């Protein structure tokens, strides 16, 4: 079999697969419970992409399409309806076996970004701050249509190529419904999500999920919100290309200090593309950012992880 490998990028050399952010820390929290079923940054160890996962770092939480018209909405601001295509510009086929167009945001919240337009044929241009509420009944990307709101009242053109560049969150206040582990309703209110990547959890009771954590910017208000991904985007890109056969359900990986060569801790990298550790500590992992994960062998459920 083709040998399994991971990239040799260090923690300060990785980016988030669920929002365009650098990886800041490794993270576990034994006090936190959630059903973990994110749809971006999902890739099996033998290179099968799942959920809404695609390869471009620029495609994560991005949209492209055209504004159809201004609309009315209960939320504050000016509201616009937008048809969405695939990120390569081709029309989205709702009958395809994906939850939504690839790159679609995979959590509930108010995503803050910039909407920009370049008119069809020295064409005219405009860009404005914009918010997409992924919890809104008007958020129906699987149906090929979403809604965004602007502070700007009038300067948005219909029937012109439109790009959404994500920047952060608008708010995480009580009314903003930010929950990184709650999926959007991709087809709106009266429909069930389809073709989802499965939920992930430790097999063993004494194990916790290990996340690659990034802190996400805020337009206003209070808080230090974060986005946790199962694997960084570079691992998704690597696994997709390698497509090495998985020889067991779990790969043993060691976090190594490249300067000293010594092992800092060990973890299980499961076949479906996520990490677990045995840790009683909580919050950010205290380890150097120049460390990296090294694949050591294929193991199984009988291999007990060392406490970190």
């Amino acid at each position: 079999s083709k040998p399994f490998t991971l990239p040799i990028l260090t923690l300060g050399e990785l980016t988030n697969s669920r929002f365009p952010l650098p990886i800041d820390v490794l993270y576990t929290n034994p006090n936190e419970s959630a059903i973990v079923q994110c749809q971006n940054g999902r890739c099996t160890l033998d290179g099968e992409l799942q959920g809404t996962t695609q390869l471009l770092p620029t495609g994560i939480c991005a949209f492209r399409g055209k504004v159809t018209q201004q609309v009315q909405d209960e939320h504050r601001g000016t509201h616009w309806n937008m048809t969405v295509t695939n990120l390569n510009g081709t029309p989205f086929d709702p009958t395809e076996d994906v939850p939504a167009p690839l790159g679609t945001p995979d959590f509930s919240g108010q995503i803050y970004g910039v909407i920009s337009q370049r008119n069809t044929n020295l064409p005219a241009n405009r860009a404005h701050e914009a918010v997409i509420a992924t919890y809104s009944p008007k958020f129906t990307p699987k149906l090929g249509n979403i809604q965004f709101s602007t502070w700007e009242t009038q300067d948005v053109s219909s029937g012109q190529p439109t790009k959404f560049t994500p920047v952060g969150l608008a708010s995480v206040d009580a009314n903003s419904h930010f929950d990184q582990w709650t999926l959007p309703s991709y087809s709106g209110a009266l429909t069930l999500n389809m073709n989802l990547a499965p939920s992930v959890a430790p097999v063993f009771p004494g194990e916790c999920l290990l996340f690659f954590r990034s802190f996400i910017p805020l337009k206003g208000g209070y808080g230090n919100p974060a986005i946790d991904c199962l694997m960084p985007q570079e691992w998704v890109q690597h696994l997709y290309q390698e497509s090495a056969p998985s020889l067991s359900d779990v790969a043993l990986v060691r976090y190594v200090n490249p300067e000293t060569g010594r092992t800092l801790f060990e973890a299980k990298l499961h076949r479906n593309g996520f990490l677990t550790v045995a840790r009683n500590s909580a919050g950010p992992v205290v380890a150097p950012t120049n460390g990296y994960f090294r694949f050591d062998s294929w193991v199984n459920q009988f291999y007990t992880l060392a406490p970190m």
Partner: nanobody
Amino acid sequence: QVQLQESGGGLVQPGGSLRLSCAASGSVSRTYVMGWYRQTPGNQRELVATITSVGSTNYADSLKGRFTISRNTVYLQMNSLKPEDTAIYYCKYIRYSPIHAPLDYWGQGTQVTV
């Protein structure tokens, strides 16, 4: 290609203690799991205690801390034994590799009577 040599065991009085020993040779691996399972007739072969190549232990929670495993070559310390601990104890070696699936190796088994 792992050969397993067991020792110890035998007859013991109730409330008593004994210590099992197992040693591994042949195509050992840098990363492995070693330990003991036990079986009585009509019951399943059950995990007792295991230890990994970096020293991480796992115990049957029904034992309630009465047993301790430590270190290749491993030793099992069995305390405050009850007639219900009477069984055949088997050494197990799991060989792990980056280039093949995990491989199991079993010992001949040693009888323990309480």
